[PDB]
Each structure stands twice: as C-alpha cells, then as structure tokens.
Coordinates of C-alpha atoms and ligand atoms in Angstrom, one line a residue:
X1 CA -6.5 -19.5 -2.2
X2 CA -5.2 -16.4 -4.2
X3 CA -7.0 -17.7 -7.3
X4 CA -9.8 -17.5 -5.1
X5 CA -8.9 -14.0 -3.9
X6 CA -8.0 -13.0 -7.9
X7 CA -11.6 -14.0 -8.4
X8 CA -12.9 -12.2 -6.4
X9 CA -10.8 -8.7 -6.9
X10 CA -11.7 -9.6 -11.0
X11 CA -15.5 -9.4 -9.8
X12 CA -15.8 -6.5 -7.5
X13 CA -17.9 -3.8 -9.1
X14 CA -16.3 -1.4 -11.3
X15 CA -13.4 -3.9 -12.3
X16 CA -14.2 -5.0 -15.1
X17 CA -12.7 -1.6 -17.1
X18 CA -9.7 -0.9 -17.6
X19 CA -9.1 1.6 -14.8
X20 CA -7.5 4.5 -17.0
X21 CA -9.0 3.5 -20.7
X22 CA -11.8 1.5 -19.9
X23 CA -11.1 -1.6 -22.0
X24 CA -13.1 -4.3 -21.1
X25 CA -11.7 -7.2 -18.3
X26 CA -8.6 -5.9 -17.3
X27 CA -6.0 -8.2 -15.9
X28 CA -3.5 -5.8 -14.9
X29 CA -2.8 -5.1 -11.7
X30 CA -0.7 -2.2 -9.8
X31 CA -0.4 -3.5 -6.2
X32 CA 0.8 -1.0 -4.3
X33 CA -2.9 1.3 -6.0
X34 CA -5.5 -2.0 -5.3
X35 CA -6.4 -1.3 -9.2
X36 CA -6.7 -3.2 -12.7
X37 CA -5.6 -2.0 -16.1
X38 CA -5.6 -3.7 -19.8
X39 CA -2.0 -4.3 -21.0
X40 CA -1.6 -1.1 -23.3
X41 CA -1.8 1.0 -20.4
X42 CA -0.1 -1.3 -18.0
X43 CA 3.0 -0.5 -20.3
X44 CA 2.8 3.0 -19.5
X45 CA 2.7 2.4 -15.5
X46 CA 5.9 0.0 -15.4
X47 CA 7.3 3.3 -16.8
X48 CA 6.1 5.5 -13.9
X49 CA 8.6 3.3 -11.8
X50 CA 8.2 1.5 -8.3
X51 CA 7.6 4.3 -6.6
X52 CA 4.4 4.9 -8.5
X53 CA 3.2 1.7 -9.6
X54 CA 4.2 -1.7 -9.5
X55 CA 2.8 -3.8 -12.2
X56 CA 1.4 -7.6 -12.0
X57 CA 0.0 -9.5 -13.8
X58 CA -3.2 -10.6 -12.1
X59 CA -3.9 -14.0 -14.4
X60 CA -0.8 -14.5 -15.5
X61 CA 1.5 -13.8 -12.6
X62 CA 2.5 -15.8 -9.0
X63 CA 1.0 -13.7 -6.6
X64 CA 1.9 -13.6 -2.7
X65 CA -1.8 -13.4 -0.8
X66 CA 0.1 -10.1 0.5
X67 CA 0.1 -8.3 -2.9
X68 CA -3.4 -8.7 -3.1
X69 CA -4.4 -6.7 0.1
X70 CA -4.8 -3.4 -1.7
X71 CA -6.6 -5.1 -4.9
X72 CA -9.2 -6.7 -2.2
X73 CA -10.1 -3.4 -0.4
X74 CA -9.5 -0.4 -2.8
X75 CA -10.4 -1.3 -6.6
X76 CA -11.3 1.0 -9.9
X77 CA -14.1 2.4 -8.9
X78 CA -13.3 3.3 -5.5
X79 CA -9.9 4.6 -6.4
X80 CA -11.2 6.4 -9.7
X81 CA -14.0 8.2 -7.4
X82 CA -11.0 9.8 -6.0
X83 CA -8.4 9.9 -8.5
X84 CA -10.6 11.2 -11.2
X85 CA -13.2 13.5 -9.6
X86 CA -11.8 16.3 -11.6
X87 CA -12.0 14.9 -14.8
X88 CA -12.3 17.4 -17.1
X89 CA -16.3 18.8 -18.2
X90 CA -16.7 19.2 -22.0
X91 CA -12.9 18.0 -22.7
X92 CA -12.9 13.7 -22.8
X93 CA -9.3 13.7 -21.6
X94 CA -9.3 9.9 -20.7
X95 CA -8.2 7.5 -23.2
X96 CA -10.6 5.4 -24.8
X97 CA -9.7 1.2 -25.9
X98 CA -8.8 2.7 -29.1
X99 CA -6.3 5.1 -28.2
X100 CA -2.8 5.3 -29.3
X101 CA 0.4 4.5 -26.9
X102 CA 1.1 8.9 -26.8
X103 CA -2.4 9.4 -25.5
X104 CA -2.0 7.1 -22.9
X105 CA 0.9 8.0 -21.8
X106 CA 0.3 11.6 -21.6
X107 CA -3.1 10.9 -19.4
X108 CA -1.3 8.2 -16.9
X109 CA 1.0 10.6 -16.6
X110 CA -0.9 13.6 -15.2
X111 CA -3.4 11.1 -13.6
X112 CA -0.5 9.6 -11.3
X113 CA 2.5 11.7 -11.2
X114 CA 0.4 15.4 -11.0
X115 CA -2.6 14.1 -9.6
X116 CA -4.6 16.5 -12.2
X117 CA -7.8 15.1 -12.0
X118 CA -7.8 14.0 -8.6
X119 CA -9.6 15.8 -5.7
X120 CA -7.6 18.0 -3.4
X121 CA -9.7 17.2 -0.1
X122 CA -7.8 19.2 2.6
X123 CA -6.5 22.6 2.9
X124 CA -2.8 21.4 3.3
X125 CA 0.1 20.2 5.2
X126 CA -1.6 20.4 8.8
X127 CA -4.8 19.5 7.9
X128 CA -3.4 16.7 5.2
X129 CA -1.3 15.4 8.5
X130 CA -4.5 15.0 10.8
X131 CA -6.3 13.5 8.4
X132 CA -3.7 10.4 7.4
X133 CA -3.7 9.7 11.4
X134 CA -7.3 10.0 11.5
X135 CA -7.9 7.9 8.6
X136 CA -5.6 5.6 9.9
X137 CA -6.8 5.3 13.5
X138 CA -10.5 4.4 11.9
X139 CA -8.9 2.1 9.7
X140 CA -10.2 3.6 6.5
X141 CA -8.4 2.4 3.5
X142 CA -10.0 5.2 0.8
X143 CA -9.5 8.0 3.9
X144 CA -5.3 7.1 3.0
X145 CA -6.1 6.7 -0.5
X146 CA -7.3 10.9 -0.3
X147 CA -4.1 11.6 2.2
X148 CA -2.3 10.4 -0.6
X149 CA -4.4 12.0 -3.5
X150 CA -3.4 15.3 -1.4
X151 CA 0.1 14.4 -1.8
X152 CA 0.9 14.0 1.6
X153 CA 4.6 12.7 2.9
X154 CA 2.9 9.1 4.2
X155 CA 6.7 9.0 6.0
X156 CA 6.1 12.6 7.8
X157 CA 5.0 12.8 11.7
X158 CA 1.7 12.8 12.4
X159 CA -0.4 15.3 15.1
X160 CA -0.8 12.2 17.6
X161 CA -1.8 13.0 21.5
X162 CA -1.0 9.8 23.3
X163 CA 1.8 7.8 20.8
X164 CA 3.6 4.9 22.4
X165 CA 7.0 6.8 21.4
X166 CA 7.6 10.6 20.5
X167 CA 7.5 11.6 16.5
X168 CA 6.2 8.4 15.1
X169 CA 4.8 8.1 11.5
X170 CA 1.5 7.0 10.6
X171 CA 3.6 3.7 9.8
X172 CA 4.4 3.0 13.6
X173 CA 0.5 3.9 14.5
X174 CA -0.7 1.8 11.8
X175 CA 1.6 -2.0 12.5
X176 CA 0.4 -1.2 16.2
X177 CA -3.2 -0.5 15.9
X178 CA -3.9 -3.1 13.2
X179 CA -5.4 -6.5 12.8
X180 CA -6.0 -9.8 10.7
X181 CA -8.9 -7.5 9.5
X182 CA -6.7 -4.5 8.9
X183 CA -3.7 -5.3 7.5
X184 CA -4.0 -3.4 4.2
X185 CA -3.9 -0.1 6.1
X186 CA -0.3 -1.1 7.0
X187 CA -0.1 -2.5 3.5
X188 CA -0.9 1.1 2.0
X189 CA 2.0 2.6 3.9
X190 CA 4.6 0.2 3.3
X191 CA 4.4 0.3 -0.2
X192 CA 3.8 3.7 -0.8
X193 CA 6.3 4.9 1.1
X194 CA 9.9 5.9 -0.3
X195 CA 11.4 5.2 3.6
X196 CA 10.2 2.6 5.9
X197 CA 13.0 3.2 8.4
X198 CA 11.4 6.5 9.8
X199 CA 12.6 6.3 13.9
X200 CA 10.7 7.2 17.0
X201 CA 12.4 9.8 19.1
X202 CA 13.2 6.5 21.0
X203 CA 15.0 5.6 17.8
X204 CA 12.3 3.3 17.0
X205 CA 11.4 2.3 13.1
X206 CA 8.6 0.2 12.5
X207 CA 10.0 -2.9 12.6
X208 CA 11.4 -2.8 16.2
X209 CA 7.2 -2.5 17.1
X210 CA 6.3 -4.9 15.2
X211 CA 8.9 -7.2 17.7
X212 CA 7.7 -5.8 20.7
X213 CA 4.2 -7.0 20.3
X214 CA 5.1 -9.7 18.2
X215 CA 3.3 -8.7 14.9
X216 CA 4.5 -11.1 12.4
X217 CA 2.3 -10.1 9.3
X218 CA 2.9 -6.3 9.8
X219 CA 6.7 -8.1 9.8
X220 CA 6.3 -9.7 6.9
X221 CA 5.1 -6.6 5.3
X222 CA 7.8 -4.3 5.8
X223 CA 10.7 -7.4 5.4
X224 CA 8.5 -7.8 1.9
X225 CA 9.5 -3.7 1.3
X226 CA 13.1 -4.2 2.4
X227 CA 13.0 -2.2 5.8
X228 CA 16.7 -2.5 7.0
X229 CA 16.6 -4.4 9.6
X230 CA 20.0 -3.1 10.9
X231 CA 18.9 0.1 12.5
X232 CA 18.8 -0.1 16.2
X233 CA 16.6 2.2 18.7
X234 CA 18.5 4.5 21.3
X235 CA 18.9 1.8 23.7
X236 CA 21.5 0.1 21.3
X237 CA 18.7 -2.4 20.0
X238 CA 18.0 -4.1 16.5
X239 CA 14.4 -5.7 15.7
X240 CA 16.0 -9.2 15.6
X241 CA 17.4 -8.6 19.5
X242 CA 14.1 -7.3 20.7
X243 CA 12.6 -10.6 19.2
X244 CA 15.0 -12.8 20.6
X245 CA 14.6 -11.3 24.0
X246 CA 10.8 -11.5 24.5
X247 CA 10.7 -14.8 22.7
X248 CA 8.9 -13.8 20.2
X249 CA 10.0 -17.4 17.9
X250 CA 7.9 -16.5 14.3
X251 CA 9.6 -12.7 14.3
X252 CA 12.9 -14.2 15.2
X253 CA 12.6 -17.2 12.4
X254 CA 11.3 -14.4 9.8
X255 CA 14.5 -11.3 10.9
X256 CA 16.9 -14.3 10.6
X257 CA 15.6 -15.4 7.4
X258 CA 16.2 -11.9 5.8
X259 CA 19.5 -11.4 8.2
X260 CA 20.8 -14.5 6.1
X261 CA 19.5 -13.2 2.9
X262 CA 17.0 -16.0 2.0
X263 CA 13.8 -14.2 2.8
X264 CA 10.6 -15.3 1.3
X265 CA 9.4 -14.5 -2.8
X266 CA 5.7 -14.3 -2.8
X267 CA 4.9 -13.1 1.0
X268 CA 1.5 -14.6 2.4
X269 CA 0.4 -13.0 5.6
X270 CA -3.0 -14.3 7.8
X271 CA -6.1 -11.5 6.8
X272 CA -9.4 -11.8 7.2
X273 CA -9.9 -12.2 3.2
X274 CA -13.8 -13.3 4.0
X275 CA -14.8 -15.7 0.5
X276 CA -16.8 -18.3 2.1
Ligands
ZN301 ZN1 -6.3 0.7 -20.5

C-alpha cells in the first residue's frame, strides 16, 4: 500500500531531481511541502526545523499513508513552478549535484525561509485572506501552496459569508468541507500551521468539528499534529464529550487513545489514493 503510493510519488513527472539541486532520483522527502530532495540537501532542511520542513526518508523510512498526502498531490515540479518562479535571470543561484554543503545552505535558506525566488501572487493581507478560503473552498491544493508562498498566517480568520460558527480559520472550513478525495487540503493546514487550536467565536477548534460530523480522518490528522484535545467550546465542551454524546464510536476510540497517551505512530487515514 504505501510502497505502492512511494511508487507512484517517485514517478510523477518532475520527481526524479532533486527538488533544490537537481541530483538525479531523489529519495528525500519533506512531508509537510509534498516534495523530494537528494540527501546533501535533505541535511540542510532538517536544519530549517519542523516548522519548515520535516524530513523523511521516502525508501528508507516507515511511512503512515497520511504523510504521503502532500507527496501524492503537490510534487517538484508543481511546487518549484511556484516556489521558484523568480529564480534569478543571468545569475544560476540554484545549486547544482556538485555543489558544496555552504552553497546549499545558503539557497535552501532564501528558497524556504525568505521565499526569494518565489512568486508573490496577491496584493497582501486581504487579498492573501480571500484567496486561502477560496482556494480552500475549490479544494485546490497548489491555490494553498501560493497562500502560503505569499506568506500568509494559514491560522488567521478568513473573509467567510455563511461559516457554521463566527471567526473560523481556513482549518475549521477545510475538516468540514472535505472528503476521501480531499483530505490533503486539510493535510496542508495541519501541518503547516504553528496552532491548530485556533477557536470559533463559539469556542470551537478544529477538532470539536471534526466530532460533530464525525470526521475521523480529518481526526486523525490533527491528533497526528498534536491538537490539544483539552480545550473545550463556550458551552463547557471537549472534542471527546461531543463524540461521546452523538455516538460517534471511531472519534471516541481515536480522542481516548491520545487522552491515554498511546495514540497511533505512523497515522493511515481512508483517501482516494487512485493506483489501480
Ligand atoms: Zn539536492
């Protein structure tokens, strides 16, 4: 199953280079980005930190089926369309298989952390806003990939009309407007976000939706990012009570596995992962 899925991310078009040096068959992969790197350069992200890029190894590594959401629908070439639109004219700024551990460093760093070569799409903070919740409500995984290219605070309110709750995130939109065919929107979020507690005006974080229409995978997901699971809404309520009172058995089983502290390692969650 996920060496089936590892197949297929190691085949898509424009994977098979390194996706900041362009060494040949990378096997490196940063899950929370959906792209592949070659070793040398996978050394430099673990150094960016989690909350840039968290390393795998694609071949080497045990992978949950959720880690490879992002790998599936995002990939090099997709993400580098974005990411390195800017690259400079007449000046070859990206490192080349040959390049020394300094040169690398000093391009992953102002590819990631400043974003220098990346496109700035919108013409800020409003704009940035409306285009996350857009790109979330169609569900288009490269339209949060340039939200994010933009720098935009994935954990900030978004301009929404008719939410279920006052002040919710793209976060609560995404867990309930997603499917088995959508999960990696949700995926995006959680692990590219530095809070996934964000409330409601109702008090509500993303979790407590996910019990009220019983969405286990989006669960699973945020559970997988360490969203407390202590915070309760205004009403007094904590995810695992909502579950327990609508019945919902598989979010129970999952809140009480965490509440007990023996939550699952490698996460697998039901998507519509398509190799037939
Ligand atoms: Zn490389």
């Amino acid at each position: 199953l996920t060496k089936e899925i590892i197949s297929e991310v190691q085949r898509m078009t424009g994977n098979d280079v390194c996706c900041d040096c362009g060494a040949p068959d990378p096997t490196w992969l940063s899950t929370n980005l959906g792209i592949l790197t070659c070793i040398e350069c996978s050394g430099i992200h673990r150094e960016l930190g989690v909350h840039y890029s968290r390393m795998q190894s694609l071949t080497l590594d045990v992978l949950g089926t959720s880690e490879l959401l992002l790998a599936k629908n995002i990939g090099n070439a997709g993400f580098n369309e974005i990411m390195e639109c800017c690259l400079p004219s007449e000046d070859p700024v990206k490192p080349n298989p040959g390049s020394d551990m300094i040169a690398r460093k000093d391009y992953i760093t102002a590819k990631y952390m400043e974003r220098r070569y990346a496109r700035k799409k919108h013409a800020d903070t409003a704009a940035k806003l409306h285009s996350l919740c857009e790109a979330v409500k169609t569900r288009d995984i490269f339209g949060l990939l340039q939200a994010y290219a933009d720098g935009v605070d994935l954990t900030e309110k978004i301009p929404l009309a008719n939410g279920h709750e006052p002040d919710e995130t793209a976060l609560h939109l995404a867990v309930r407007s997603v499917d088995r065919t959508s999960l990696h929107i949700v995926d995006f979020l959680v692990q590219n976000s530095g809070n996934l507690d964000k409330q409601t005006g109702k008090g509500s974080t993303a979790l407590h939706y996910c019990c009220l229409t019983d969405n286990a995978e989006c669960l699973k997901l945020l559970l997988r990012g360490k969203a407390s699971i202590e915070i309760a809404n205004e009403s007094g309520e904590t995810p695992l009570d909502i579950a327990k009172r609508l019945k919902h058995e598989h979010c129970e089983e999952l809140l009480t596995q965490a509440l007990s502290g023996r939550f699952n390692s490698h996460v697998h969650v039901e998507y519509e992962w398509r190799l037939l």
